Design a binder for this molecule. Structure first.
Ligand SMILES: *[C@@H]1O[C@H](CO)[C@@H](O[C@@H]2O[C@H](CO)[C@@H](O[C@@H]3O[C@H](CO[C@H]4O[C@H](CO)[C@@H](O)[C@H](O)C4O)[C@@H](O)[C@H](O[C@H]4O[C@H](CO)[C@@H](O)[C@H](O)[C@@H]4O)[C@@H]3O)[C@H](O)[C@H]2NC(C)=O)[C@H](O)[C@H]1NC(C)=O
Ligand SMILES: *[C@@H]1O[C@H](CO)[C@@H](O[C@@H]2O[C@H](CO)[C@@H](O[C@@H]3O[C@H](CO[C@H]4O[C@H](CO)[C@@H](O)[C@H](O)[C@@H]4O)[C@@H](O)[C@H](O[C@H]4O[C@H](CO)[C@@H](O)[C@H](O)[C@@H]4O)[C@@H]3O)[C@H](O)[C@H]2NC(C)=O)[C@H](O)[C@H]1NC(C)=O
Ligand SMILES: *[C@@H]1O[C@H](CO)[C@@H](O[C@@H]2O[C@H](CO)[C@@H](O[C@@H]3O[C@H](CO[C@H]4O[C@H](CO)[C@@H](O)[C@H](O)[C@@H]4O)[C@@H](O)[C@H](O[C@H]4O[C@H](CO)[C@@H](O)[C@H](O)[C@@H]4O)[C@@H]3O)[C@H](O)[C@H]2NC(C)=O)[C@H](O)[C@H]1NC(C)=O
Ligand SMILES: *[C@@H]1O[C@H](CO)[C@@H](O[C@@H]2O[C@H](CO)[C@@H](O[C@@H]3O[C@H](CO[C@H]4O[C@H](CO)[C@@H](O)[C@H](O)[C@@H]4O)[C@@H](O)[C@H](O[C@H]4O[C@H](CO)[C@@H](O)[C@H](O)[C@@H]4O)[C@@H]3O)[C@H](O)[C@H]2NC(C)=O)[C@H](O)[C@H]1NC(C)=O
Ligand SMILES: CCCCCCCC/C=C/CCCCCCCC(=O)O[C@@H](COC(=O)CCCCCCCCCCCCCCC)COP(=O)([O-])OCC[N+](C)(C)C
Ligand SMILES: CCCCCCCC/C=C\CCCCCCCC(=O)O[C@@H](COC(=O)CCCCCCCCCCCCCCC)COP(=O)([O-])OCC[N+](C)(C)C
Ligand SMILES: CCCCCCCC/C=C\CCCCCCCC(=O)O[C@@H](COC(=O)CCCCCCCCCCCCCCC)COP(=O)([O-])OCC[N+](C)(C)C
Ligand SMILES: CCCCCCCC/C=C\CCCCCCCC(=O)O[C@@H](COC(=O)CCCCCCCCCCCCCCC)COP(=O)([O-])OCC[N+](C)(C)C
Ligand SMILES: CC(C)CCC[C@@H](C)[C@H]1CC[C@H]2[C@@H]3CC=C4C[C@@H](O)CC[C@]4(C)[C@H]3CC[C@]12C
Ligand SMILES: CC(C)CCC[C@@H](C)[C@H]1CC[C@H]2[C@@H]3CC=C4C[C@@H](O)CC[C@]4(C)[C@H]3CC[C@]12C
Ligand SMILES: CC(C)CCC[C@@H](C)[C@H]1CC[C@H]2[C@@H]3CC=C4C[C@@H](O)CC[C@]4(C)[C@H]3CC[C@]12C
Ligand SMILES: CC(C)CCC[C@@H](C)[C@H]1CC[C@H]2[C@@H]3CC=C4C[C@@H](O)CC[C@]4(C)[C@H]3CC[C@]12C
Ligand SMILES: CC(C)CCC[C@@H](C)[C@H]1CC[C@H]2[C@@H]3CC=C4C[C@@H](O)CC[C@]4(C)[C@H]3CC[C@]12C
Lengths: 197, 115, 51, 156, 230, 49, 49, 155
C-alpha cells in the first residue's frame, strides 16, 4: 500500500548470556514512554506496546529464555509522495488521451504522444530514486506507474493505426464493406451526430 | 532557418531541452552555494535567457510570416521600415443559347478567381 | 510503401527473436541443484550425515 | 566569524528552563536551550532553478501566437515545455526535504506550472481541432460560430 | 580476489635510499594496473558511434520531409544524456583531458555542425525564387561543375473578346507559374548538390577523426618494463 | 476522377476521425477507472480507520 | 476560413485567460515567501554589526 | 531479504594440503550463501517499459511517409533507450567479465533502432523523389509495384 502503507516494527530486547532462571526481565510499563518523543516529519505512531515472552526449548526445560518486544504501528505521511510522484503521473495519464482529439492533419499526434512517453521515461529517474527498490511486492505507486506507461504505449500504437487509416486513398486500398457499415453508418447514429456523413 | 521548413520551433525548443538536460550536468559538477553567483552560473543564465529570447522572437517571426492578407492588413510603418529602408543596407530583392453564355461566365469566373 | 512493408516483415521478427533469446538466457538461469558441482551432497538439515 | 555560504544567523537567544519540580515528579530538572534563528540565502535556487523554470514555464503562453495549421508546432512548444518541467522535477527531487508535514514552495510552484502547461496543451489541442475542420467531415455549427464571431467582439 | 575492472601488469618492489642523521629509507611496492574498458565500450562508445552514423545520415534525408532538424537535434540531446552518464565516472582533475571526453566533445561538435549545415541546406531549398536571384557563379559551380564529380546527373463580339482575354490571362499565369517553378527547381537542385557534398565531407571528417582517436586509444599499451629509461 | 479519389479519401478520413472520437472516450474513461482501481480501495480503507 | 477565424478568436481569449492564471498563481506562491520574513523578535542581533 | 532469496547455505571445513601446518592459511571454515535475486522490482520498473518502448520503433514502418513524424519517433525511442542506459549505469559495477543481460538487450535495441532510423531516412528519400530529381526505371517499378506487393500480400 506504499505510500499509504502502515508498518508494525518491533524491538526485541533480552539478556544475551543470562537465561530466565538467573536473570528475570520485566516491563516497566505496558507501553513505551513517548513523553519526550520528537515529532516525525514522515510517520505517525498510531499504537505502541510492549510484551514479555518466555520460550522454553525441549532440550533445556529448566532454563527459560525471556525477552521483551516493543512494537510500534506507524502510518506513513503520504503528502510528499502524493505531490512529487502521483500528481505528475496523473497529469501524464490525462495528457495521454488528448492525442485522440488532435486532428491527423495537424501533423503533431506522434509529437504529443512520444513527448508524453519521453516525459514518463525521464520521470522514471525520479520514481526509482524516490521509490524503494524491493521485490517483496509491487507498490501501489509502481502499479500506477506501470499502468500509465502501458497505456501511453497503447495510445501510441493505436494512434499509429489511426494515422495509417486517415491517409488511405483508392490508389493504396479499397474500403471493405464492414468498415463502412460499422464506422460510417451505425456508430454515428448512436453518437452526438454533429458530424457530417 | 526558413519558416516554410516548419522546423523553427523544433530546433529552438530542442536546443532548450538539451540545455535543460545539461543543467543536470552543471549542478552535478559545479559547487552549489549562495555566497555569490559564479562565472559559470552567469554564463549559464546568459545562455538560458539567450535561448528563451530566441524562442520568443522566433514565435514573433513565425507569426509575422503567417499573417493572412484578409484578416490582417500591413501598416504603412512596417512597409516603410522593413520593405523600403532596411534592405538598402542588405542585399535582397524587394517585394446564343443559355448554356454557351454560362460557359463564358464560367471561364470569366475562373480568370477572376485566379486574379 | 513496399520498402516499408518489407522492412517491417524483416526487422520486427529479428527484434522479437533476439529479445526472446536474450531474456530466455536469464529466465532459465537458475542456481545448480547442489551447492558444489561434483559433490552430490545437498548440505541441508533434512539430509543429515550421521557419524 | 565567517558566515555560512547558505545560512545567515539572525538571532540566537538562550534560556534556562526548569521543569519536573512537582511533588509527584520529585527531583527538579533543568537545561539550557539556545534558539538559532537562521535565514537561508536563496541565491543558488533563484539563479539555477527558479528563474530558468519560470521562463521555461512561461514559454507555453507563446503557443497561443503560433498558427493553428500543420506547420505551427503549437503542440511542439507546449508538450516540450512539460518535458523540460519533468527534467526540473528530477532536478528538484535531489534538493527538497523529504518530509510530509507540508509542501515546499519550490514543489508547489513546479506542480502549479505543470498543471498550467497541461491545461494549455489541452487548450491547444481543442483550438487545433476547431481550426482544421473542413466541410468534407464536419458541418458548420452555427451556434459556436455566432458565439465566437459575433458576440465575442461585442463583449470585448 | 581478482578485480573485475583492473589487470595487474607489473608488481615490483624497491628499496629507496635517502638522498645523500634524520634520513629514512623506504620500501615502495608498485602496482601497474590496466583498466578493462568493456563497460565504457558498451555504454558510451557504441552509442556515440550510432549517433554519429545518424548525424551522417541526416544529409540523405530529403528537405521536403521536414525532419532534418528533429533528427540532428535529438541526436545532440542523446549525446547530452551520455555526458550526464559520464559525469559520475570520469576523473575531476585538470592536468589533461580524458580521451573519452575528447571523443564525446568531438561527437557533439560533429552533431552541431550537422545541425548547422542542415540549416544551410534547408535555407537553400526553401529559398523564394522571386525574392532571391541565383548569382551566376552559384549556377556554374553547383549546377554544372560539381554534379559531375558527385555523380549527380540532373534528368533532362464582346463575349468572344472577353473569352479570348480570359484564356490569354490563364495561359500567361500558368507560364509565370512555370518560370517560377523552374527557378524553384534550380534552387532545390543546388540544395541537393550541397547536401550531397556535405554528406561526403561529413563521412570523410567523421571517419578520419574517429580513426585517429581510436588508434590513439588502441595503441596506448601498458609499459613492458616497470622502470623504463627516461 | 480526382473528385472521386478525394471522396474516397474523405471517407477514409471520416472513419479515422470516428475511431479517434471513440478512443478519446475510451482513454479518458480508462484514465479515471485505472486511477480509481489503483488507489480507491486503500483510501476508502484508511477512511474507515 | 470561417473555422480558422473561430480558432483564432478562441486562441485570443484563451491567451489572456492563461496569462492571468499563470501570473496570479505564481505571484501568490512567491508572495507567500515575501511575507515570510524572520519575525521582528525582542532580542539583539546574534552578530553585532 | 527483500531482494535476495537463499537457495543453498552450506558450511565446509577447508584444509589446504599444500600449505605448511604452521601457516594461518592451512585451515578455515567457510559458510557459503547461494542467493537468487528476486527480479520483480527490475522487471516492473525497468524491463517491461524498456522492452515495450524498444518495440515501439517497429510502428514507424506502419506510419505513412506523409505523416512527417517517422524519424522523430525512431530517434525518440533511441533517446529513451539512452535514458534507460543512464539508469542502469548507476546500479552495477563497471566490470569486464561479461555484458549484463539488460546491457545486452539495450545494446541490441539501440543498434536495431539505429538501423530503423537509417531505414526511415532511406524510405523518406525514396518517397519524395520526383521526375525533376530522379528517374524511375521500369525495372524498379516491376520489382516494387507489382512483384513484391503481390508476394507481401499488400492491399
Ligand atoms: C524558536 O524555538 C524556541 C524553542 O522552542 C521558542 O521559544 C519557546 O517557545 C515555546 C512556545 O512555542 C514556549 O513554550 C511556552 O512556555 C510557557 C511557559 O511554560 C511554563 O509556564 C506554563 C505556565 O505559564 C506551565 O504551563 C509550563 O509548565 C511551564 O514551565 C507556556 O506558558 C506557554 O504556553 C502557551 O502556549 C502554548 C502553545 O505553545 C499553549 O498551548 C498554552 O495554552 C499557552 O498559551 C508555552 O508552552 C517556550 O517557553 C519558549 N522558550 C523556550 C526556552 O523554549 C521560540 O519562540 C521559537 N522562535 C520562533 C520565532 O518561533
Ligand atoms: C506488531 O508486532 C508485535 C510483535 O509481533 C505484535 O505483538 C503481539 O501483540 C499481541 C496482542 O497484543 C500479543 O498477544 C497477547 O500476548 C499476551 C502475552 O502473551 C505472552 O505472555 C504470556 C504470559 O507470560 C504467555 O503465556 C504467552 O505465551 C506470551 O509469552 C497475552 O496475555 C494476550 O492474551 C490475551 O489476548 C488474547 C487475544 O487472542 C486472548 O485470547 C487471551 O485470553 C488474552 O485476553 C495476547 O495473546 C502478542 O503476544 C504480541 N507478540 C509479540 C511478539 O510482542 C503486535 O500486535 C503487532 N502490532 C500490530 C500489527 O498491531
Ligand atoms: C561457490 O564458490 C565456492 C568457492 O568459494 C565453490 O566451492 C568450490 O567447489 C569446487 C567444486 O566442488 C571445489 O573444487 C574441488 O576441490 C577438491 C579439493 O581440493 C582441495 O585439495 C587439493 C589437493 O588434493 C588442493 O590442491 C585444493 O586447493 C583443495 O585444498 C578437489 O578434490 C576437486 O577435484 C575434483 O573435481 C574436479 C572437477 O573439475 C576434478 O577435475 C578432479 O579430478 C576431482 O574429481 C575440486 O577441484 C573447490 O575447492 C570449492 N572451493 C571451496 C573454497 O571450497 C562452490 O562450488 C561455488 N558454488 C557454486 C558455483 O554453485
Ligand atoms: C611508476 O612510478 C615509479 C615511481 O615514480 C617509477 O620509478 C621511477 O622510475 C624512474 C625511471 O622511469 C627512475 O628514474 C631513474 O633513476 C635511475 C637511478 O637514479 C637513482 O640514482 C641517482 C644517482 O644517485 C639518484 O639521483 C636518483 O634519485 C636515484 O636514486 C637513473 O639512472 C635513470 O636515468 C634515466 O632517466 C633520466 C631521466 O632524466 C635520463 O636523464 C638518464 O639518461 C636515464 O635514461 C632515471 O632517472 C626513478 O628512480 C624511479 N623511482 C623509484 C622511487 O624507484 C616507475 O618507473 C613508474 N612506472 C612506470 C611509469 O612505468
Ligand atoms: C540501414 C541498413 C542499410 C541500408 C538498407 C536499405 C534498405 C532499403 C533498400 C533500398 C533500395 C531502394 C531502391 C530505390 C532506388 C532504385 C533505383 C536505383 O537504385 O537507382 C537510382 C537510385 O539509387 C539508389 O537510390 C540506390 C539504392 C537505394 C539506396 C538506399 C540508401 C543507401 C543505403 C546504403 C547502405 C547504408 C549502410 C549504412 C547503414 C547501415 C540511381 O540514381 P543515383 O542518383 O545514382 O542513386 C544514388 C544512390 N546513393 C546515394 C545511395 C548512392
Ligand atoms: C527573454 C529576455 C528577458 C528575460 C527576463 C527574465 C530573466 C531575468 C533574470 C534575472 C536574474 C537576476 C537574479 C538576481 C538575484 C535574485 C534576486 C534577489 O536577490 O531576490 C531574491 C530572489 O528573487 C525573488 O524574489 C524571486 C524571483 C522569482 C520570481 C518569479 C515570479 C514568476 C511570476 C511572475 C509573473 C533573493 O534574495 P532576497 O531573498 O530578496 O534577499 C533578501 C535579503 N534580506 C533578507 C537581507 C533583505
Ligand atoms: C514567465 C514570463 C515570460 C514568458 C515568456 C515570454 C512572454 C510570453 C507571453 C507574452 C508576451 C509575448 C507576446 C508575443 C506576441 C507576438 C506577436 C503576435 O503573435 O501577436 C498576436 C496578437 O498578440 C497580441 O494581441 C499582443 C500580445 C502581447 C502580450 C504581452 C504580454 C506580456 C497575433 O495574433 P493573430 O493575428 O491572431 O495571429 C496569431 C494566431 N493565433 C492566435 C492562432 C496564434
Ligand atoms: C544483428 C543485429 C545487431 C547486433 C547486435 C549485437 C549486440 C550485442 C549482443 C551481445 C554481445 C555480447 C558479447 O559477447 O559481446 C562480446 C564482444 O563485445 C564487444 O566488444 C561488442 C561491443 C562493441 C562496442 C563498439 C566498439 C567500437 C569501437 C563480449 O562478450 P563478453 O563481455 O565476453 O561476455 C558477454 C556475456 N556472455 C559471456 C554470457 C556472453
Ligand atoms: C492491466 C494493465 C493494462 C494496466 C495496469 C498495469 C499492469 C501491468 C499491472 C497492474 C497490476 C500488476 C500485477 C500486480 C501483482 C502482481 C503479482 C506478482 O506476481 C507481481 C506481478 C503482478 C502479476 C503484477 C504485474 C503487473 C500488473 C498486472
Ligand atoms: C514480447 C516477447 C515476444 C518479447 C521477447 C522477450 C520476453 C518478453 C519473453 C521471451 C521469452 C519469454 C518467456 C518464456 C517462458 C516463460 C515462462 C512462463 O512460465 C511465464 C512466461 C515466460 C517468462 C515468458 C515471457 C517473457 C519472455 C522472457
Ligand atoms: C493543482 C494546482 C491547482 C495546485 C498545485 C499545488 C498543490 C501541490 C497545492 C495546492 C493546495 C495545497 C495544500 C493547501 C493546504 C494544505 C494544508 C496544510 O496543513 C498541509 C499542506 C496542504 C495539504 C497543501 C499541499 C499542497 C497543495 C495541494
Ligand atoms: C498555486 C495556486 C493555483 C493556488 C494557491 C492556493 C494557496 C491559498 C495555498 C497554496 C499553498 C498553501 C499553503 C501550503 C502549506 C501551508 C502550511 C500550513 O502549516 C499552513 C497553511 C499553508 C501556509 C498553506 C496556505 C494556503 C496556500 C498558500
Ligand atoms: C511484452 C511483455 C511480455 C512485457 C515484457 C516482459 C519482459 C521484460 C520479460 C523478460 C524476462 C521475463 C520474466 C522471466 C521469467 C518469468 C517467469 C515467472 O517468474 C513469471 C514471469 C517472469 C518473471 C517473466 C516476466 C516477463 C519478463 C520480465
Amino acid at each position: 500500500h506504499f505510500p499509504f502503507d502502515e508498518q508494525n516494527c518491533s524491538m526485541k530486547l533480552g539478556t544475551w548470556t543470562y537465561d530466565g532462571s538467573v536473570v528475570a526481565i520485566n516491563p516497566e510499563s505496558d507501553q513505551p514512554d513517548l513523553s519526550n518523543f520528537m515529532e516525525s516529519g514522515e510517520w505517525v505512531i498510531k499504537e505502541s506496546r510492549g510484551w514479555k515472552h518466555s520460550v522454553t526449548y525441549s532440550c533445556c526445560p529448566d532454563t527459560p529464555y525471556l525477552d521483551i518486544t516493543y512494537h510500534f504501528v506507524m502510518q506513513r505521511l503520504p503528502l510528499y509522495f502524493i505531490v512529487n510522484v502521483i500528481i505528475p503521473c496523473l497529469l501524464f495519464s490525462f495528457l495521454t488521451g488528448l492525442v485522440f482529439y488532435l486532428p491527423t492533419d495537424s501533423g503533431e499526434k506522434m509529437t504529443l504522444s512520444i513527448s508524453v512517453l519521453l516525459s514518463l521515461t525521464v520521470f522514471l529517474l525520479v520514481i526509482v530514486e524516490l521509490i524503494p527498490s524491493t521485490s517483496s511486492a509491487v507498490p501501489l505507486i509502481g502499479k500506477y506507474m506501470l499502468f500509465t506507461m502501458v497505456f501511453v504505449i497503447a495510445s501510441i500504437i493505436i494512434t499509429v493505426i489511426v494515422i495509417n487509416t486517415h491517409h488511405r486513398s483508392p490508389s493504396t486500398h479499397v474500403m471493405p464493406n464492414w468498415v463502412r457499415k460499422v464506422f460510417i453508418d451505425t456508430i454515428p447514429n448512436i453518437m452526438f451526430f454533429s458530424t457530417m456523413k | 532557418l526558413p519558416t516554410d521548413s516548419g522546423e523553427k520551433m523544433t530546433l529552438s525548443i530542442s536546443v532548450l531541452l538539451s540545455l535543460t538536460v545539461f543543467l543536470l550536468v552543471i549542478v552535478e559538477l559545479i559547487p552549489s552555494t549562495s555566497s555569490a553567483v559564479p562565472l559559470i552560473g552567469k554564463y549559464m543564465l546568459f545562455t538560458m535567457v539567450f535561448v528563451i529570447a530566441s524562442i520568443i522572437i522566433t514565435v514573433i517571426v513565425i507569426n509575422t510570416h503567417h499573417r493572412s492578407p484578409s484578416t490582417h492588413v500591413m501598416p504603412n510603418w512596417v512597409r516603410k521600415v522593413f520593405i523600403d529602408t532596411i534592405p538598402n543596407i542588405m542585399f535582397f530583392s524587394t517585394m446564343k443559347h443559355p448554356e454557351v453564355k454560362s460557359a463564358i461566365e464560367g471561364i470569366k469566373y475562373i480568370a477572376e478567381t485566379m486574379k | 510503401r513496399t520498402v516499408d512493408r518489407l522492412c517491417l516483415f524483416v526487422v520486427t521478427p529479428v527484434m522479437v527473436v533476439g529479445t526472446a533469446w536474450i531474456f530466455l538466457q536469464g529466465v532459465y538461469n537458475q542456481p545448480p541443484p547442489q551447492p558444489f558441482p561434483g559433490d552430490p551432497y545437498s548440505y541441508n538439515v533434512q539430509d543429515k550425515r550421521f557419524i | 566569524y565567517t558566515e555560512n555560504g547558505e545560512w545567515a544567523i539572525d538571532f540566537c537567544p538562550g534560556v534556562i528552563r526548569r521543569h519536573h519540580g512537582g511533588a509527584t515528579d520529585g527531583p527538579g530538572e533543568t537545561d539550557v536551550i539556545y534558539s538559532l534563528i537562521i535565514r537561508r540565502k536563496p541565491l543558488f535556487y533563484v539563479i539555477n532553478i527558479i528563474v530558468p523554470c519560470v521562463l521555461i514555464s512561461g514559454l507555453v503562453l507563446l503557443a497561443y501566437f503560433l498558427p493553428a495549421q500543420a506547420g505551427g508546432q503549437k503542440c511542439t512548444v507546449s508538450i516540450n515545455v512539460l518535458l523540460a518541467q519533468t527534467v526540473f522535477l528530477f532536478l528538484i527531487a535531489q534538493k527538497i526535504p523529504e518530509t510530509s508535514l507540508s509542501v515546499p514552495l519550490l514543489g508547489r510552484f513546479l506542480i502549479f506550472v505543470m498543471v498550467v502547461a497541461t491545461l494549455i496543451v489541452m487548450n491547444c489541442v481543442i483550438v487545433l481541432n476547431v481550426s482544421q475542420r473542413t466541410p468534407t467531415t464536419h458541418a458548420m455549427s452555427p451556434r459556436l460560430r455566432h458565439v465566437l464571431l459575433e458576440l465575442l467582439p461585442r463583449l470585448l | 580476489i581478482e578485480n573485475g575492472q583492473w589487470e595487474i601488469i607489473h608488481k615490483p618492489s624497491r628499496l629507496i635510499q635517502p638522498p645523500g642523521e634524520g634520513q629514512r629509507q623506504e620500501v615502495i611496492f608498485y602496482l601497474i594496473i590496466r583498466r578493462k574498458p568493456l563497460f565504457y565500450l558498451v555504454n558510451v562508445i557504441a552509442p556515440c558511434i550510432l549517433i554519429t552514423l545518424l548525424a551522417i545520415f541526416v544529409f540523405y534525408l530529403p528537405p521536403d520531409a521536414g525532419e532534418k532538424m528533429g533528427l540532428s537535434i535529438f541526436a545532440l540531446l542523446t549525446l547530452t544524456v551520455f555526458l550526464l552518464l559520464l559525469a559520475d565516472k570520469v576523473p575531476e582533475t585538470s592536468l589533461s583531458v580524458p580521451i573519452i571526453i575528447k571523443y564525446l566533445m568531438f561527437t557533439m561538435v560533429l552533431v552541431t555542425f550537422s545541425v548547422i549545415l542542415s540549416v544551410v541546406v534547408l535555407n537553400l531549398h526553401h529559398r523564394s525564387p522571386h525574392t532571391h536571384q541565383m548569382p551566376l557563379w552559384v549556377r556554374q559551380i553547383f549546377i554544372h561543375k560539381l554534379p559531375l564529380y558527385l555523380r549527380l546527373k540532373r534528368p533532362k463580339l464582346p463575349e468572344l473578346r472577353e473569352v479570348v482575354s480570359s484564356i490569354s490571362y490563364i495561359a500567361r499565369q500558368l507560364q509565370e507559374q512555370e518560370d517560377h517553378d523552374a527557378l524553384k527547381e534550380d534552387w532545390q537542385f543546388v540544395a541537393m548538390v550541397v547536401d550531397r557534398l556535405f554528406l561526403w565531407t561529413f563521412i570523410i571528417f567523421t571517419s578520419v577523426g574517429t580513426l585517429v582517436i581510436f588508434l590513439d586509444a588502441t595503441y596506448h599499451l601498458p609499459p613492458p618494463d616497470p622502470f623504463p629509461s627516461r | 476522377s480526382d473528385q472521386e479519389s478525394n471522396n474516397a479519401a474523405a471517407e477514409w478520413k471520416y472513419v479515422a476521425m470516428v475511431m479517434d472520437h471513440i478512443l478519446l472516450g475510451v482513454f479518458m474513461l480508462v484514465c479515471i477507472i485505472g486511477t480509481l482501481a489503483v488507489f480507491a480501495g486503500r483510501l476508502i480503507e484508511l477512511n474507515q480507520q | 476560413s470561417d473555422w480558422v477565424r473561430m480558432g483564432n478568436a478562441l486562441d485570443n481569449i484563451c491567451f489572456w485567460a492563461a496569462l492571468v492564471l499563470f501570473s496570479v498563481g505564481s505571484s501568490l506562491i512567491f508572495l507567500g515567501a515575501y511575507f515570510n520574513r524572520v519575525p521582528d523578535l525582542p532580542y539583539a542581533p546574534c552578530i553585532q554589526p | 531479504n527483500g531482494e535476495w532469496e537463499i537457495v543453498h547455505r552450506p558450511a565446509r571445513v577447508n584444509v589446504d594440503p599444500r600449505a605448511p601446518l604452521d601457516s594461518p592459511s592451512r585451515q578455515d571454515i567457510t559458510f557459503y550463501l547461494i542467493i537468487r535475486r528476486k527480479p520483480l522490482f527490475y522487471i516492473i520498473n525497468i524491463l517491461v517499459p524498456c522492452v515495450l518502448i524498444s518495440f515501439m520503433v517497429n510502428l514507424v514502418f506502419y506510419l505513412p511517409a506523409d505523416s512527417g513524424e517517422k524519424t522523430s519517433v525512431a530517434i525518440s525511442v533511441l533517446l529513451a533507450q539512452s535514458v534507460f542506459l543512464l539508469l542502469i549505469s548507476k546500479r552495477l559495477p563497471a566490470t569486464s567479465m561479461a555484458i549484463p543481460l539488460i546491457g545486452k538487450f539495450l545494446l541490441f535495441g539501440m543498434v536495431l533502432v539505429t538501423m530503423v532510423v537509417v531505414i526511415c531516412v532511406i524510405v523518406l528519400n525514396i518517397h519524395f523523389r520526383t521526375p525533376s530529381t530522379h528517374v524511375l526505371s521500369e525495372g524498379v517499378k516491376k520489382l516494387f509495384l507489382e512483384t513484391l506487393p503481390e508476394l507481401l500480400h499488400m492491399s
